[PDB]
């Protein structure tokens, strides 16, 4: 077993468990460890999680720090677990997964992924650790990612960014866009094709194309026009009506880095996970025009166009389905006289 | 009764308490409410209260989230409880008031706000919600707000700004601007004239006059001299004295926006309750100028004009009332030769 | 002995201890201290320290505000106890010393620096409190600070920045360089030659000298041209690799100001307590370079220009033993035919 | 207000709070409250209430300590508060009463009973304190307890028993036995003519009567016999049936001990709170029979006798109303060709 | 240093610490150690001290479990710490010293008792362990225990008690009564002459003399009578008198065990440490007599009977000094017309 103290040592020295051998002294209190320097308490490891405070230090010290897949992705591929190593959701402050694999005995169902514990859960597998993809060739329900091909298997492209250390970026000196592969009970499995979204923050937006280009530095109208966009409900859709009481529509992340533009807006987030779709209680600091449980989805604006005019607007009201993040996403499609009324993610 | 698994099913769908049915699982764990999505706990509601975490959680998902007054506001006139709401502090991140009329069974002291039990307590009643402007005309003590007129009562008109989830505002899309009526011991007071408190912060403040303007574009002297200020001590009192170790004067929040334009100030706000008057331990970044307890209250430079240009200086020193927040202000006056030495609010 | 209710009501009053007399009602709950106003409970302080809620407290309460040495340099100086005050860690909200003399019942080891109980401890003595540079005079081991000289003692002048209530600045109304003085076992100590390490944070650094302004201005090659110092590794050591998976070099914290110039940086301090070299996980987000365990220092350019423009570059590879906040600061020196390859602190 | 270090003092020295002045030095910690007795920490109260740990810490030292009655009384009589003492439950190990009188201001709602916020509760007051007798006189709600005439009122004689310190007695040094008196809206009530519950464990057991020797010493049809009680159900209601697997009857304490005297019973107090009818999941050792929510009620052999032998045992099934501790108790009587089913308390 | 693993190993295969290597898995939560065992968490410690879990866990693991000084005589004497072992203070479920010697990291003061922060610590040394004698010869302060005789030293025999993990007891397989010596400031001192306290709990009280079988079995005048004793106020002191509300005498051990064949008392143990002298609140069960802050000591009838007929009875009040567990205590005499009226410890 892998001893406290020892997982202590290497946060100390180096920021995260890399198997150096050593002790440091500890302390658990108020659900945190200290370790004494000099004959002071210094805390290293606050714990956030419902696990056990000394579980969850190690299992964060064994955080992979490596790129790796932004956690909606995992969720909604229907990945149960990862493979020897520990997926750390930094949103949450948790291990992602519930249990592990030749991680930590505490939480491990299973020393390798080729047991019988882990043949009915999706395991992550990594392409660029030794022997990973032979695994995943052999295990009924997985998961394989990779920097590039795999002979005898079509691969999916996956999203540009991956999370690095928390961090969600598009790689230049390390690589972050990986190619999926899938497998369920024993069968590889064809991944559909899929939008994805862009994983922004309100308060740092940066456009990804011309179109969010023209969109952030453009007038209403004058962008409605050049990009043709007339009876698409933009102006309430995407830029949103603050003109009432009740805040309406506002559903692409692009909008709200507009209205942020002239004036802040106060976001809760009241299910705080990584989601493709989020849900948020949104407060208009200029107006007082809010809106609790309000869909959000932050998709390149040229890929909301065209899922939108894509759109037969004949009917009154349809449930539209749409793949993102290798999700089958709902949108509530209302139309009138031929125009769209709104069209936003059902969560 | 209420349920905790159908608070939660409320929170995790809308955001807040709606009444819908239904129910999701939780976690009770380090003082906090978990709810599992896909076998993973994710944080809902982290309890800052001193009241037990499911009762915390109950109260605030029945939070009131239309616009709604002050807390310093309704302190100041003396409310107890409101009715059939539950009004949350923000600053503290608990509920406004001790007990509860007619919203849940762990804090109701009543539930309808025509019992005895009430019939000594301050009830907020609130014109916007159907019958009670009328359970305010028969309550023996009461507050109540109004968007417009009560017929056959004299409203004292409050303050521009009102809360909407914690971001106090002007609203342009809801009204934020109460009409004021109270009554003690089944009569109908006379409120008094009262300044109001800006409710401005020290990060982000904004002038709301060309007086304030001028105060934050113009240099010292050349704002005195435009105002004929010479003799009220705007120096000490105002853009405060930063030259001895000990921080002298700075008592109006403007001056404070003011150094800030300069150099950072840290504010400890020790007592952090909302409060017309508030107190503070004041560090300057830039000269290592400090001050523990010091008076800040936030008027706009007009209104605080007014005050000091209409006192007589003829005394040494003697103890000013004004009115604001409808609450009797203290305020401290030393003079010297008929100038001014210092005025600030007493706490 | 003091009590729980007479240190609050100095808190509420003025923000710390005091003196006066009074006492204010309070809850402790959740490692907290709450004071109730008008019947409801407002949190005065929350316990981050490993010591009781109602000690810590005490001891926060009796923080020194004076300004005081930045907590490096006390341990750098092996200082174990202040004499007659608490010197508090703003850093990681806690005392920085585990005993006390004269403060609290609790803590303390003694009542006065005299006793027998502090002759093998060094203990601080604050020249601006009457009777302790006598005191410091008669002690065994102890460091003196003092404003300016001390008669037949000679001074050591210490660092320009000192702190004042957990803000690190120069004083301009007040006074934050202190003359040291050391004794050891009743022997006057020579304090050797030192730099100072300058204490910038990465949000908010500002250069100090002609150089720096140039190395923040001016791009690389010109910066190196201009100060001769080809051959001196500074590519690597000082503007920091991002061209590989793992980050190089960058251990000057005006590197890592001048990358935040163009992109933003995360910085994990894993071990949050102040020191001379600090140790972190640094992640570029704009090439997702990223190293744990990186040393990092603040020196000021030109300081550590001259340290390296000393070295002997002869030899392949040696640690080097440079003085830096009265630490013997050992760096690695790997050089190759005549030229650096890095230099770095060993933490 | 009084401070937790004096409280701390008169503890230590006195075992409860005396108003002597002092200060014992404290530690707040795990919910408890530990003084320090030559550098170590030794506890002296632990927290088994829901109130924060040093205002129970209070109220518990400030614990009435002559005899008072037992909690079942009051509530059944209807004591919401107590005038200037604090009525500690000892089965609980808190408070009786959510609120207090003139002891504490972090549970007062008033300093003396005579005040406004008392009008509309019960209020106990106790006529061995000097002018209690005239408050009560005066008072619009409360119960008064005496030792003996209060002139002008008309008593009740209570139960025999009362508690001292927690320990539940018949005083022949002290007394136990008092006379009560009740006002509802400023009108004296006639309290009814009541049976006592008789307070006995069935640790401890002891006879009161020859009935009840003659119960636990003769065999059950020689008792039933001897006391003229066929028909009455006694072999099912008393002596208890463990024939099947759900245990049967067995609603008297007496019956309860009768059984102990062969063989062990297990009793979870599912709902550990003081009162006239218990309800207690019972398992029978010997046999394996058992019953969850069972009704048991200690009252005198002979006086539950004469409750069942004045029943009209004509009907098939009815609720029969019985006066015990004040309360009114409902029974459930069925009845068979014109004996006895079983008889018992309806909690 | 010691990991927490490995002192799981060693508790749960051996139930203390043996220095044995291996590991166990260990969950921390809720201030106590789980171990897992087949999936399943079981504690293995629950902490009832002021210091962290695991630190506690450690020192409780290394409990000394040999024979080993009750408490009160190490306090009594002085002794601060111990020499390489942990002294377990079971009444109090936490360690008797503050810090410690060659034990734990985190309590260490020193590695050896020979170094200089024990120098003015009064050292438990122990002869039964190698070099500890030699050890005691060079300290400056310290005491020695040993079986036998110590060359060169005047042994004071001790008491014939000792604790055996947590039960004190007289040896027959092994030896309880040690050989006690001290020094202080270098200097051999000269213990006094002492009685010993007895440590008999009420529960189990056996008698130990002839006089005290006679005490227990013989009618209270027939024993005064026999043991030539009126005069000497045993009706008030040791049989106790129960006549009023308040308690009356009662201060001998063995006065409570002969109560106790009759009737129970209550005893509140308001500041639980072991000493010589004994605070309780006491309550009568019989009577309901009571008193809070009764001073019980229990010596041997005998012994206590020769303290007090060796009193001068001429005098109204004297406070007369006994030695009594090596602790000089303080008793308060009272006579009347040269007979005794009570003679009690002074606590």
Redesign the interface.
């Known amino acids: ?6 997982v202590a040592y290497n ?6 468990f890399d198997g150096h051998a050593g ?9 945190a460890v ?11 490891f606050e714990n ?3 696990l ?4 969850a230090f190690e299992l964060w010290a064994k955080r992979n ?1 490596k ?1 790796v897949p932004e956690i909606k992705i995992l ?1 909604n591929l229907g990945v ?1 677990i990862a493979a020897n190593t520990v997926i750390w959701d930094y949103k ?1 402050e ?1 291990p ?3 249990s592990t694999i030749g991680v930590c ?2 939480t491990d169902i299973a020393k390798k992924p080729t047991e019988s514990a882990c043949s009915s859960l999706t395991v992550l597998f990594d392409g660029r650790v030794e022997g990973q993809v032979d695994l995943f060739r052999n295990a009924r329900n997985g998961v394989l990612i990779t920097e590039g091909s795999v002979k005898g298997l079509t691969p999916s492209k996956g999203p540009a960014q991956a999370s ?4 969600t ?6 690589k ?1 866009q990986f190619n999926y592969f899938k497998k369920v009970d024993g069968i590889i499995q064809q991944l559909p094709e899929t939008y994805f979204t862009q994983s922004r923050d309100l308060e740092d937006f940066k456009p990804r194309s011309q179109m969010e280009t023209d969109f952030l530095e453009l007038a209403m109208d004058e962008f409605i026009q050049r990009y043709k966009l007339e009876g698409y409900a933009f102006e309430h859709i995407v830029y949103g009506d ?4 009740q805040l309406g529509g506002l559903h692409l992340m692009i909008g709200l880095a507009k209205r942020s533009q002239d004036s802040p807006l ?1 976001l ?1 987030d ?4 990584d989601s493709t779709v989020k ?3 949104i ?8 809106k ?2 309000c869909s959000v989805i932050d998709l390149l604006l040229g890929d909301f166009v065209e899922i939108i005019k894509s759109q037969d607007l004949s009917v009154i009201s349809k449930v539209v389905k749409v793949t993102i993040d290798y999700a089958e996403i709902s949108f509530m499609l209302w139309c009138k006289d031929g125009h769209v009324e709104t069209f936003y993610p059902k969560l």
Chains 1, 2, 3, 4, 5 share one sequence.
């Open positions: 077993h892998q001893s406290l103290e020892n946060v100390v020295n180096k920021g995260h002790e440091a002294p500890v302390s658990i209190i108020n659900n200290y370790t004494k320097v000099d004959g002071i308490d210094v805390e290293i956030k999680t419902t056990p405070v000394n579980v720090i790129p969720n149960d949450r948790a992602a997964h519930v005995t505490m690095v250390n928390g961090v970026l598009i790689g230049e000196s390390v972050t603050f003109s009432h009481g106060k809760e009241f299910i705080p996970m849900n948020y209680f407060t208009d600091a200029q107006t007082g025009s809010s609790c449980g």
